[PDB]
């Protein structure tokens, strides 16, 4: 039914049956506490949407909880929030918290909501430990987040100082066609998306066709902290950070675009920890790279095997293209001094990247940047395997013989890569095709009903005066008195 007030919405949501449709009349729903515990069924979801997307606003001290299964939340604009700062925490439920499986949040706008620290959307475990699976977050816009924690957290374990061989279960969520543009916070402040927490966690989440444009929240654009997540066809434009395989072996990144097109800040880029990954057909063209990380497009982590800062080794880096990167194309030992400290403290064995299969990559430069293509201060003949790559435009920086014949360049055919269970993508086919398409634009991911890109940061790298004042207050209360 159509509802026009918080009270009537609360009532209809308690009565709605599978296949039901709840439509919210044009208006502002201030301090709305939407809790949906009922469930739809496969083929008969329950849909809660704005009757006219773009005309419904959830504001004030609001909260949405999707506890039932087979629910769809659509066309809501979240703004002008006012949740209690003493009542929300990073690592807790998001403004929208998804506790049930088979749920979808689509075509929603989250714009500088408020000053309470938390994610904008989370999949969250219920108190009895049940983990939501098979959810989808798509065609949503997340802009000007001025609070700590990631924009989205996909959880399969409760936060804990951890380290027991037990890990969270596979989630099988998908985050697609979302837009992310958010300002830089200080320190380990929470980035764009976090999936899982530690290496024993299994993710199997698909993150595809998203546009991160000045997603600058913190060092990590995405901190992928679980095994077997697949990142396909995402565009990272002028982002002050790197997309990371932080924890969890056997992760996949195929055909993503990492573009930096001005000199305003250092951009990224990928920082990789762990082994057995598949990093293929990605395109890196970065006008400026990140000094603090080591000035590179692809950073391969040195350290102790399978540790808290797991050594990057035994993986396939294929058919990628590094075009005019103003930094190293690949840095084989970033932050090595800190990693030696971590290894010494825990009495672990410090090692450097090896057993890498670098096949069919193109390294090209025709702009006056000064960086050789590679940095490997621990180079050892034969530790890595290089085949079918092409390098031209600047010295390589390491003693490896690579063809300089650009005209003869061709991505390599690969057919031995196992697909990820639960994710319908033919990795062999995609990798063998080489790099397809081009960077995604706002019109390719925007909510169907929204023409104008929201936010003040994406196009300017600066929050408007009002939002900057609120951001300043959030930052100040989170630090030392
Ligand atoms: C993420 O998305 C981006 C694009 O936004 C992709 O970007 C490309 O790749 C990047 C690497 C590059 O950077 C970029 O530049 C691009 O090159 C990126 O790869 C990712 O792709 C994934 O997401 C896509 C997305 O969601 O946009 C996926 O594409 C969709 O795939 C499904 C397609 O649907 C099928 O085709 C449509 C037209 C329907 O079929 C037609 O149905 C008509 C009516 O029945 C019929 O008359 C016609 O004969 C059919 O052809 C659809 O059918 C289904 O729906 C219809 C109703 O519309 C009926 O109900 C049917 O019963 C039902 O089956 C088809 O389903 C197979 C969709 O069009 C397409 O957009 C992509 O596959 C992902 O990999
Ligand atoms: C516990 C843990 O390992 N967590 C990791 C997390 O590691 C943390 O990374 C930060 C970082 O932002 O790099 C790091 O803090 C930085 O440490 C350096 C020294 O190594 C500087 O500290 S200082 O020596 O006291 O100055 C640095 O400060 C910056 O110094 C300089 C300069 O002189 O170059 C200029 C700057 O103005 C000043 O800010 C400091 N940065 C900050 C913001 O304080 C922590 O020590 C480190 O624990 C990350 O992993 S890692 O790969 O970056 O090492 C994170 C992934 O991004 O993952 C967590 O698990």
């Amino acid at each position: 039914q159509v509802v026009a007030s918080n009270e009537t919405l609360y009532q209809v949501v308690k009565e709605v049956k599978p296949g039901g449709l709840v439509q919210i009349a044009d208006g502002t729903y201030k301090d709305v506490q939407l809790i949906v515990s009922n469930s739809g069924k496969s083929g008969l979801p329950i849909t809660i949407k704005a009757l006219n997307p773009g005309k419904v606003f959830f504001t004030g001290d609001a909260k949405v909880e999707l506890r039932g299964e087979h629910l769809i939340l659509e066309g809501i604009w979240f703004k002008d929030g006012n949740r209690a700062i003493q009542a929300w925490k990073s690592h807790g439920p998001g403004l929208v918290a998804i506790y049930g499986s088979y749920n979808r949040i689509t075509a929603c706008v989250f714009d500088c909501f408020d000053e309470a620290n938390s994610a904008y959307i989370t999949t969250s475990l219920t108190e009895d430990g049940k983990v939501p699976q098979h959810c989808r977050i798509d065609h949503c816009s997340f802009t000007d987040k001025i609070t700590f924690d990631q924009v989205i957290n996909l959880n399969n374990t409760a936060r804990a100082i951890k380290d027991g061989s037990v890990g969270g279960p596979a989630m099988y969520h998908r985050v697609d066609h979302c837009f992310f543009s958010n300002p830089q916070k200080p320190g380990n402040a929470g980035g764009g998306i976090r999936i899982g927490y530690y290496r024993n966690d299994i993710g199997r989440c698909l993150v595809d066709s998203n546009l991160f444009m000045r997603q600058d929240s913190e060092a990590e654009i995405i901190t992928s902290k679980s095994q077997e997540n697949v990142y396909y066809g995402n565009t990272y434009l002028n982002c002050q950070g790197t997309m990371n395989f932080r924890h969890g072996d056997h992760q996949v990144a195929i055909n993503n675009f990492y573009i930096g097109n001005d000199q305003r800040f250092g951009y990224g880029g990928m920082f990789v920890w762990g082994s057995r990954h598949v990093i293929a057909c990605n395109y890196f063209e970065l006008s400026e790279t990140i000094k603090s990380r080591g000035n590179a497009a692809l950073y391969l982590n040195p350290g102790a095997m399978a540790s808290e800062h797991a050594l990057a080794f035994d993986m396939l880096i294929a058919n990628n293209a590094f075009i005019n990167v103003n930094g190293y194309a690949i840095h084989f030992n970033p932050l090595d001094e800190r990693r030696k400290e971590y290894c010494a403290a825990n009495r672990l064995k410090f090692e450097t990247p090896h057993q890498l299969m670098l096949k069919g990559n193109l390294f090209f430069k025709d702009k006056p940047y000064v960086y050789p293509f590679f940095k490997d201060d621990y180079f050892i003949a034969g530790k890595n395997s290089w085949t079918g790559n092409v390098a031209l435009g600047v010295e390589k920086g390491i003693p490896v013989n690579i063809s300089a014949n650009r005209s003869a360049y061709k991505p390599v055919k690969i057919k031995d890569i196992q697909p990820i269970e639960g994710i319908a993508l033919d990795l062999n086919a995609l990798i063998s095709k080489g790099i397809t398409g081009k960077p995604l634009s706002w019109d390719e991911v925007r909510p169907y009903w929204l023409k104008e890109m929201p936010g003040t940061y994406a196009l300017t790298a600066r929050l408007s005066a009002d939002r900057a004042a609120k951001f300043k207050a959030v930052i100040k209360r989170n630090k030392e008195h």
Side-chain angles (χ1 to χ4, degrees), residues 174 177 208-209 232-233 255 257 425 436-440 444:
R174 178 179 183 206
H177 300 91
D208 66 310
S209 305
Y232 174 63
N255 218 112
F257 289 87
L425 292 175
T436 72
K438 66 176 208 170
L440 292 162
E444 297 177 273

Side-chain angles (χ1 to χ4, degrees), residues 198-241:
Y198 293 108
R199 75 182 294 277
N200 297 328
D201 296 340
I202 308 301
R204 288 179 193 156
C205 288
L206 174 63
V207 173
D208 66 310
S209 305
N210 296 286
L211 172 59
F212 299 83
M213 184 180 180
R214 300 200 186 284
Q215 168 46 42
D216 299 347
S217 298
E218 63 132 272
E220 310 188 82
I221 300 177
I222 291 176
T223 187
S224 193
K225 293 180 163 190
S226 45
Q227 301 172 43
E228 307 191 350
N229 291 307
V230 179
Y231 298 87
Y232 174 63
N234 296 287
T235 290
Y236 303 86
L237 172 61
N238 298 331
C239 295
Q240 292 196 73

Side-chain angles (χ1 to χ4, degrees), residues 105-124:
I105 174 160
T106 181
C108 288
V109 167
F110 294 82
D111 183 37
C112 194
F113 192 67
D114 65 9
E115 291 174 31
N117 297 315
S118 78
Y120 279 173
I121 302 172
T122 58
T123 51
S124 296

Side-chain angles (χ1 to χ4, degrees), residues 210-423:
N210 296 286
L211 172 59
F212 299 83
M213 184 180 180
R214 300 200 186 284
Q215 168 46 42
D216 299 347
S217 298
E218 63 132 272
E220 310 188 82
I221 300 177
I222 291 176
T223 187
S224 193
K225 293 180 163 190
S226 45
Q227 301 172 43
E228 307 191 350
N229 291 307
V230 179
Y231 298 87
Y232 174 63
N234 296 287
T235 290
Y236 303 86
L237 172 61
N238 298 331
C239 295
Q240 292 196 73
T242 56
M243 184 276 134
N244 299 348
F245 283 175
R246 180 67 187 86
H247 288 302
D249 294 333
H250 196 200
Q251 299 202 54
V252 181
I254 296 171
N255 218 112
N256 297 282
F257 289 87
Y258 300 96
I259 312 291
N261 61 20
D262 62 39
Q263 318 155 51
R264 199 174 189 81
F265 310 106
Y267 303 124
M270 285 183 71
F271 206 111
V272 178
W273 286 253
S275 61
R276 302 196 289 117
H277 304 307
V278 178
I279 300 174
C281 310
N282 295 290
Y283 182 91
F284 300 83
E285 182 166 7
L286 299 166
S287 56
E288 292 289 345
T289 52
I290 307 167
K291 179 189 176 181
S292 80
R293 302 303 92 180
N295 285 291
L298 174 63
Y299 302 92
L300 302 184
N301 188 67
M305 187 178 326
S307 68
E308 173 69 9
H309 275 292
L311 172 69
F313 77 107
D314 183 25
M315 71 186 76
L316 176 63
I317 297 167
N319 297 340
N320 300 284
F322 299 82
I323 306 303
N324 286 318
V325 168
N326 179 16
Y328 303 102
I330 307 180
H331 191 317
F332 296 85
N333 57 262
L335 308 179
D336 54 326
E337 292 92 350
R338 320 179 166 187
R339 297 292 189 258
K340 278 183 148 291
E341 261 181 39
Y342 164 77
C343 288
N346 295 285
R347 204 170 288 194
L348 305 179
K349 178 179 175 64
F350 174 84
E351 307 188 55
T352 42
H354 62 276
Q355 254 188 301
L356 309 170
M357 308 297 290
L358 296 119
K359 305 190 168 175
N361 301 284
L362 169 63
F363 305 92
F364 174 71
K365 176 186 159 301
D366 69 358
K367 292 192 182 191
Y369 303 135
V370 305
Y371 300 86
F373 290 126
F374 314 113
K375 178 168 173 63
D376 189 349
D377 294 303
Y378 305 80
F379 181 85
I380 289 178
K383 73 176 184 158
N384 295 324
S385 174
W386 301 76
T387 305
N389 304 282
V390 164
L392 83 155
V394 67
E395 67 166 61
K396 287 167 279 296
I398 55 168
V400 176
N401 181 176
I402 304 174
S403 169
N405 192 346
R406 175 80 185 65
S407 295
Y409 177 67
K410 273 187 144 184
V412 181
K413 260 67 176 185
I414 296 183
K415 294 146 182 177
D416 63 322
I417 305 313
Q418 292 300 302
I420 299 297
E421 182 271 314
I423 293 175

